[PDB]
Amino acid sequence: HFPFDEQNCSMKLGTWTYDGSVVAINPESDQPDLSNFMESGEWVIKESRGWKHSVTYSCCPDTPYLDITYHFVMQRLPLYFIVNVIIPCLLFSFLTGLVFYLPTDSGEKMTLSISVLLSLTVFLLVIVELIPSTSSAVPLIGKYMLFTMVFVIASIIITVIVINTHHRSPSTHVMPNWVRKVFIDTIPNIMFFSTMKHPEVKSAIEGIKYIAETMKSDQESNNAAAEWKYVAMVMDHILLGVFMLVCIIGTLAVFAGRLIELNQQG
Amino acid sequence: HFPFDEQNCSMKLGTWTYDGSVVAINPESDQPDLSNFMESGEWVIKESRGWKHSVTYSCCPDTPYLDITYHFVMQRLPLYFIVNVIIPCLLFSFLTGLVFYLPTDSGEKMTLSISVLLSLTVFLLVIVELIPSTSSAVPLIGKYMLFTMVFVIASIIITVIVINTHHRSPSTHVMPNWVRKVFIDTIPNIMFFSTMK
Amino acid sequence: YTENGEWAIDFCPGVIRRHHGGATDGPGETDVIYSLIIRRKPLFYVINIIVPCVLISGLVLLAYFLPAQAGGQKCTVSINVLLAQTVFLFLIAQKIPETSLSVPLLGRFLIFVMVVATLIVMNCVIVLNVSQRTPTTHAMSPRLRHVLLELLPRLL
Amino acid sequence: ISFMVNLVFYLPADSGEKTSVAISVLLAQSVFLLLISKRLPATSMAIPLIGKFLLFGMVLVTMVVVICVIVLNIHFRTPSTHVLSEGVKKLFLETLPELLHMS
Amino acid sequence: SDWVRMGNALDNICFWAALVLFSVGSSLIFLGAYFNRVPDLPYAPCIQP
Amino acid sequence: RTVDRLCLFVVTPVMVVGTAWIFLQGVYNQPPPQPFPGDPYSYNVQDKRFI
Amino acid sequence: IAPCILITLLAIFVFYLPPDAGEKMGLSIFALLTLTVFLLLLADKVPETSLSVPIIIKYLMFTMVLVTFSVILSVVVLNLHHRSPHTHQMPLWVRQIFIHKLPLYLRLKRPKLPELREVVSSISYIARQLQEQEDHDALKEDWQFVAMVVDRLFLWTFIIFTSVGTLVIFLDATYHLPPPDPFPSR
Ligand SMILES: *[C@@H]1O[C@H](CO)[C@@H](O[C@@H]2O[C@H](CO)[C@@H](O[C@@H]3O[C@H](CO[C@H]4O[C@H](CO)[C@@H](O)[C@H](O)[C@@H]4O)[C@@H](O)[C@H](O[C@H]4O[C@H](CO)[C@@H](O)[C@H](O)[C@@H]4O)[C@@H]3O)[C@H](O)[C@H]2NC(C)=O)[C@H](O)[C@H]1NC(C)=O
Ligand SMILES: *[C@@H]1O[C@H](CO)[C@@H](O[C@@H]2O[C@H](CO)[C@@H](O[C@@H]3O[C@H](CO[C@H]4O[C@H](CO)[C@@H](O)[C@H](O)[C@@H]4O)[C@@H](O)[C@H](O[C@H]4O[C@H](CO)[C@@H](O)[C@H](O)[C@@H]4O)[C@@H]3O)[C@H](O)[C@H]2NC(C)=O)[C@H](O)[C@H]1NC(C)=O
Ligand SMILES: *[C@@H]1O[C@H](CO)[C@@H](O[C@@H]2O[C@H](CO)[C@@H](O[C@@H]3O[C@H](CO[C@H]4O[C@H](CO)[C@@H](O)[C@H](O)[C@@H]4O)[C@@H](O)[C@H](O[C@H]4O[C@H](CO)[C@@H](O)[C@H](O)[C@@H]4O)[C@@H]3O)[C@H](O)[C@H]2NC(C)=O)[C@H](O)[C@H]1NC(C)=O
Ligand SMILES: *[C@@H]1O[C@H](CO)[C@@H](O[C@@H]2O[C@H](CO)[C@@H](O[C@@H]3O[C@H](CO[C@H]4O[C@H](CO)[C@@H](O)[C@H](O)[C@@H]4O)[C@@H](O)[C@H](O[C@H]4O[C@H](CO)[C@@H](O)[C@H](O)[C@@H]4O)[C@@H]3O)[C@H](O)[C@H]2NC(C)=O)[C@H](O)[C@H]1NC(C)=O
Ligand SMILES: CCCCCCCC/C=C/CCCCCCCC(=O)O[C@@H](COC(=O)CCCCCCCCCCCCCCC)COP(=O)([O-])OCC[N+](C)(C)C
Ligand SMILES: CC(C)CCC[C@@H](C)[C@H]1CC[C@H]2[C@@H]3CC=C4C[C@@H](O)CC[C@]4(C)[C@H]3CC[C@]12C
Ligand SMILES: CC(C)CCC[C@@H](C)[C@H]1CC[C@H]2[C@@H]3CC=C4C[C@@H](O)CC[C@]4(C)[C@H]3CC[C@]12C
Ligand SMILES: CC(C)CCC[C@@H](C)[C@H]1CC[C@H]2[C@@H]3CC=C4C[C@@H](O)CC[C@]4(C)[C@H]3CC[C@]12C
Ligand SMILES: CC(C)CCC[C@@H](C)[C@H]1CC[C@H]2[C@@H]3CC=C4C[C@@H](O)CC[C@]4(C)[C@H]3CC[C@]12C
């Protein structure tokens, strides 16, 4: 649950070379003395208590072995990690979805996406510098950071797909019927946006006719390309919505469980 | 010659307060005892030898000063620095020249060159944390990194000049005769000539 | 016993050794040697370094799908993946051991993906150079045209 | 690397890679500042010479980025968005080019 | 357009070449680790399960 | 283009002169000839001050 | 502090960069990357406690949020600029607010016989195509002017928001003087 983690840490004390039959130990009080305890800027001691334990073995039934274990329940103060780790990750995650609102014709989609990835990679140095590095379990910070990384990678891949769809040449590529039905016909129904008699004389005559046919063919080619551009624009809208939803719900699914648990337990 | 360097360090031993006329020292053996020497993951001991030395000063000719000096010739194992330092520098050096095969109309020449420069700048962190921070001489890795940095910088300068030349138009400039003769006439004759004049 | 956060103790045999008992050796010697066989739990390196590095290094394959035009940003993607790999090199330099008896797997993988990224950068540069040729500067080579456009689809 | 920022003035505005070069030089200077920050104490008696150069270079590179933004803004003007007065044409196409020995 | 088609064909074949290289090399590097388990020694575990 | 050329010829000399001044302050920085200002003695082995 | 100020100035100046240059995103996002480098710089210096946030950390996060908003609103401006005229119909309220009302307040002045039959057909077709091109260009110019007006509005808004936030933080830091008396009365 780091940095919202609670730690139970003990201190077992006993006479190393004397057993309970020659030296008996008893706690002075049921709790440790915290009267002169200096406040900690990183931890809060919720509970503290000292328990006496006696252990006897069948080999030595007349010599019990005594110890006093003091344990402290400590709760981490998470403000430092919230401010220095979580907020930049949230900003990068929010910026991840903005590429789907950035038009392909700007020529800056990969700039934005790859540079967000670069900023996250550079911030990974900060992540390693700040949080501890252990393999006992995946921390909550680690889960959120990995989620953000996968979010950025998926955004980059889907952005490349969208750009490729945008630049589909109408000559080499022909439109599948399923793409037309899904994206031009069905999906826009739920889209509430702004979307949708000398030889020389004869040569001159043929030249004007050829120019007219050239402009006509260019018009058809541009319309066919514009269909692909419209398709990519529909995918971009849906992906913007989906990625903004995934960002919010991923943040909630990561943190809200432990946050609600701590809220309910005071 | 770092990281392919060979180092000769010794250990000078002697009685601090006793001269040779009261306490005499002699080595047990010609060489240090290395029978129980644990393997080193960074150095190989090529040679080892212990030498006795006697120093007499004119002030006190009858009181020699003795010492036994054990020296060790050590060769660095360079695989770590080859893998971590030299190979990335070689990759950046190779990437430096690829900008000159990029078309100017791509609008990616500066992106490539500047990103290579930025990679080298980030790599300077690795090198300065790894390189010895001493001024006795330039380490060989330091020379190679300075080479790569200087020549990616030169590539950036020349790429800017090439882009400027590519974008020229009669509305801003006029082709001089010498440029035309040098670049359009003579050089293509001694080239592959696949590109038409 | 609380297991170490990174290391699991699998085996720990003990042996009593005796040596130097020969006449030339002189008085015999003995010792006790315990061999702690410990296994690393690699979860931290998997989550924090290896998986992000693998994904960022796989991104260069996407450069093959971008258009070979001014707005394609094919070289943008490849060289920035190389830059991110350099950042990961700085990250990994703080963790790996600093011996030279062998190359660690993490370093080997990082250098391999860096070499692959460099080759893909060269490949993208070549593809761009081929794609944006115009008749005002280049003459149409028919050998390459036949090899790529006519022979290849029929061979495929 | 700091002197490399001056090449942006010789880059044409149609290349579309000017502010990228300048801001990348700024990023490299920031990396060098990070490198130097680990090597000296944080005393206030004086600014180090290398620190003085780095601050001066960062300020100059920032000014160069601003200049590049302004130059691109001027370059991409058209009749439908701006009006080109005769005074600007006289100053910037006749007098300054011949003063500066431009082609 | 012929030049663009040639570039597209080169990019298509080179994608598969690069994918095979990346996959095979990464798989070999990590399979080196997958076969690096602790050897089956003739001793009991240090900690009883 | 004219604005760019003017900015080149205005900005590059400023950069060069500022860098040169900043680094020349350090290039010609040496400790004083004597260890103690105001004391002409060099505190060297050659210049022994015999009683 | 000084690099952060310079980065903030560049983030402001993004909004003066024309959309046609195709360079807004690079400048804004590399400013963000430089700020990330400076966050790495501060990680080795700042205290690790959680009772409060250092004011320099507050300034760094404020600058990061400013650059993030500059990125977001540059994306908005580019979306408006590159808007395809035939796929979008400009709403009338957009026309009113962003072409008639706001530009005055932002000081943006917008300036302003088979052969013969086949000849007639071809010429008429070419003229009709060019007229359609002119109409398309007019709608595109309307969208681009809306983008320019929105860009100027965001430029002024960023100047105001940067000035206010920077002044608040800097005055909070400046007027934190040590106590005149070692044992003040509370
Ligand atoms: C963090 O970790 C520490 C351990 O390091 C935990 O400490 C334990 O706390 C519990 C109480 O919550 C202790 O349990 C109590 O122990 C008392 C003493 O037991 C010793 O002495 C008796 C003598 O007869 C022996 O029989 C016994 O074996 C021990 O040697 C008991 O008297 C208590 O009894 C109470 O509870 C039982 C039911 O459990 C009732 O039947 C009784 O009537 C009575 O109400 C109790 O068992 C435990 O011993 C502590 N362990 C140690 C090692 O100190 C912390 O609780 C933990 N913190 C967390 C996770 O919040
Ligand atoms: C790393 O650095 C160390 C220290 O500088 C070097 O050690 C020196 O190694 C050389 C050998 O290459 C040593 O020189 C040898 O010294 C012997 C000393 O003999 C003793 O007896 C004489 C009186 O007879 C005394 O004066 C002396 O102090 C000793 O008590 C000599 O016997 C050797 O003789 C060899 O050279 C002479 C000619 O000079 C020949 O006539 C002989 O046949 C023979 O070949 C020799 O002079 C030197 O003393 C070492 N110095 C120290 C300080 O230990 C390492 O060599 C170096 N490692 C590298 C760079 O590889
Ligand atoms: C490296 O660092 C060391 C210190 O660690 C410097 O040494 C100091 O050098 C200065 C200048 O040489 C010394 O200051 C001088 O002290 C003299 C003696 O003062 C003592 O005696 C008088 C009574 O006779 C007492 O009142 C006084 O408190 C001291 O106990 C003075 O006579 C010198 O006077 C000079 O300065 C005054 C004021 O400007 C003038 O009016 C005089 O004419 C004259 O010029 C002077 O004040 C200082 O004591 C040294 N510190 C030590 C030895 O610890 C090195 O100079 C420095 N090296 C470099 C290269 O920077
Ligand atoms: C740096 O850190 C030190 C230590 O933390 C601070 O020192 C504390 O300063 C405060 C404020 O000056 C002190 O609090 C005051 O103590 C006075 C004396 O209290 C002692 O004596 C009385 C009996 O006469 C005992 O009952 C008491 O326990 C103490 O032994 C009180 O008289 C003061 O009360 C008056 O002022 C307060 C506030 O206005 C009113 O509410 C009261 O009604 C009354 O008028 C007051 O409590 C405190 O004792 C100091 N701690 C020490 C000395 O250890 C420094 O102030 C701090 N420096 C900074 C931040 O600048
Ligand atoms: C070193 C920094 C300064 C470099 C200056 C280089 C100049 C080179 C020479 C430029 C010659 C231009 C000739 C053609 C235009 C003539 C008419 C005219 O002036 O109006 C045009 C502006 O044209 C300008 O260039 C105005 C000056 C720059 C404005 C940017 C902000 C101030 C400078 C940067 C900040 C300095 C402090 C912070 C950084 C240190 C049209 O104006 P507008 O677009 O309709 O309205 C602008 C309104 N706005 C300003 C609110 C957006
Ligand atoms: C602009 C492009 C071509 C790069 C130019 C690099 C030049 C300026 C660099 C590269 C190597 C440098 C030299 C490397 C080492 C030394 C020795 C020492 O006494 C400092 C100066 C001196 C002599 C340097 C002077 C400047 C230098 C020659
Ligand atoms: C450049 C690409 C192809 C490979 C990238 C990985 C590099 C670092 C790998 C490939 C082959 C590897 C070598 C293969 C075998 C040996 C012998 C062994 O006794 C020591 C390590 C050493 C010398 C390896 C060092 C690391 C190495 C050089
Ligand atoms: C990465 C791709 C491209 C190339 C892979 C080549 C393979 C065969 C190389 C890469 C790394 C190499 C290993 C690196 C180091 C060692 C340790 C040494 O004591 C024995 C050989 C051994 C175990 C090598 C065996 C061969 C090896 C596995
Ligand atoms: C600048 C804005 C836009 C973005 C960054 C938000 C920063 C400044 C916020 C996030 C969390 C905040 C802290 C949350 C709680 C506390 C504890 C108490 O002592 C009040 C102030 C203090 C210490 C806040 C100071 C401001 C703070 C650090």
From Swiss-Prot, chain A:
It is a multi-pass membrane protein. One of its GO terms (cellular component) is neuron projection. Isoform 1 is only expressed in skeletal muscle. Isoform 2 is constitutively expressed in skeletal muscle, brain, heart, kidney, liver, lung and thymus. It comes from Homo sapiens (Human). The chain crosses the membrane at residues 80-100, 112-132, 144-164, 237-257. Changing residue 123 to L: In CMS1B; fewer and shorter ion channel activations with decreased channel opening rate and increased channel closing rate. Its main location: membrane. It is linked to Multiple pterygium syndrome, lethal type: Multiple pterygia are found infrequently in children with arthrogryposis and in fetuses with fetal akinesia syndrome. In lethal multiple pterygium syndrome there is intrauterine growth retardation, multiple pterygia, and flexion contractures causing severe arthrogryposis and fetal akinesia. Subcutaneous edema can be severe, causing fetal hydrops with cystic hygroma and lung hypoplasia. Oligohydramnios and facial anomalies are frequent. The alpha subunit is the main focus for antibody binding in myasthenia gravis. Myasthenia gravis is characterized by sporadic muscular fatigability and weakness, occurring chiefly in muscles innervated by cranial nerves, and characteristically improved by cholinesterase-inhibiting drugs. Disulfide bonds join 59-60. This is Acetylcholine receptor subunit alpha. Residues 133-143, 258-266 are extracellular. The keyword Disulfide bond applies. One of its GO terms (biological process) is synaptic transmission, cholinergic. Glycans are attached at residue 8. Coiled coil: none annotated.
UniProtKB/Swiss-Prot annotation, chain B:
Residues 101-111 are cytoplasmic. GO terms for biological process: acetylcholine receptor signaling pathway; membrane depolarization; monoatomic ion transmembrane transport; muscle cell cellular homeostasis; musculoskeletal movement; neuromuscular junction development; neuromuscular process; neuromuscular synaptic transmission. Changing residue 108 to Q: Changed acetylcholine-gated cation-selective channel activity. The chain crosses the membrane at residues 80-100, 112-132, 144-164. Changing residue 116 to F: In CMS1A; causes increased channel opening in absence of ACh; prolonged opening in presence of ACh; increased affinity for ACh and enhanced desensitization. The keyword tRNA processing does not apply. Changing residue 152 to I: In CMS1B; abnormally slow channel opening and closing resulting in abnormally brief current. GO terms for cellular component: acetylcholine-gated channel complex; cell surface; neuromuscular junction; neuron projection; plasma membrane; postsynaptic membrane; postsynaptic specialization membrane; synapse. Disulfide bonds join 59-60. Keywords: Cell membrane, Congenital myasthenic syndrome, Disease variant, Disulfide bond, Glycoprotein, Ion channel, Ion transport, Ligand-gated ion channel, Membrane, Postsynaptic cell membrane, Receptor, Signal, Synapse, Transmembrane, Transmembrane helix, Transport. Isoform 1 is only expressed in skeletal muscle. Isoform 2 is constitutively expressed in skeletal muscle, brain, heart, kidney, liver, lung and thymus. Glycans are attached at residue 8. It is found in: Postsynaptic cell membrane; Cell membrane. It comes from the Eukaryota.
UniProtKB/Swiss-Prot annotation, chain E:
The chain holds residues 445 to 493 of 493 of the full protein. It is linked to The muscle AChR is the major target antigen in the autoimmune disease myasthenia gravis. Myasthenia gravis is characterized by sporadic muscular fatigability and weakness, occurring chiefly in muscles innervated by cranial nerves, and characteristically improved by cholinesterase-inhibiting drugs. Myasthenic syndrome, congenital, 4A, slow-channel: A form of congenital myasthenic syndrome, a group of disorders characterized by failure of neuromuscular transmission, including pre-synaptic, synaptic, and post-synaptic disorders that are not of autoimmune origin. Clinical features are easy fatigability and muscle weakness affecting the axial and limb muscles (with hypotonia in early-onset forms), the ocular muscles (leading to ptosis and ophthalmoplegia), and the facial and bulbar musculature (affecting sucking and swallowing, and leading to dysphonia). After binding acetylcholine, the AChR responds by an extensive change in conformation that affects all subunits and leads to opening of an ion-conducting channel across the plasma membrane. The chain crosses the membrane at residues 13-36. It is found in: Postsynaptic cell membrane; Cell membrane. This is Acetylcholine receptor subunit epsilon. Coiled coil: none annotated. It comes from the Eukaryota. Residues 37-49 are extracellular.
Swiss-Prot record, chain F:
It comes from the Eukaryota. It is found in: Postsynaptic cell membrane; Cell membrane. The chain crosses the membrane at residues 6-24. After binding acetylcholine, the AChR responds by an extensive change in conformation that affects all subunits and leads to opening of an ion-conducting channel across the plasma membrane. Belongs to the ligand-gated ion channel (TC 1.A.9) family. Acetylcholine receptor (TC 1.A.9.1) subfamily. Delta/CHRND sub-subfamily. Pentamer of two alpha chains, and one each of the beta, delta, and gamma (in immature muscle) or epsilon (in mature muscle) chains. The muscle heteropentamer composed of alpha-1, beta-1, delta, epsilon subunits interacts with the alpha-conotoxin ImII. This is Acetylcholine receptor subunit delta. It comes from Homo sapiens. The gene is CHRND. The chain holds residues 467 to 517 of 517 of the full protein.
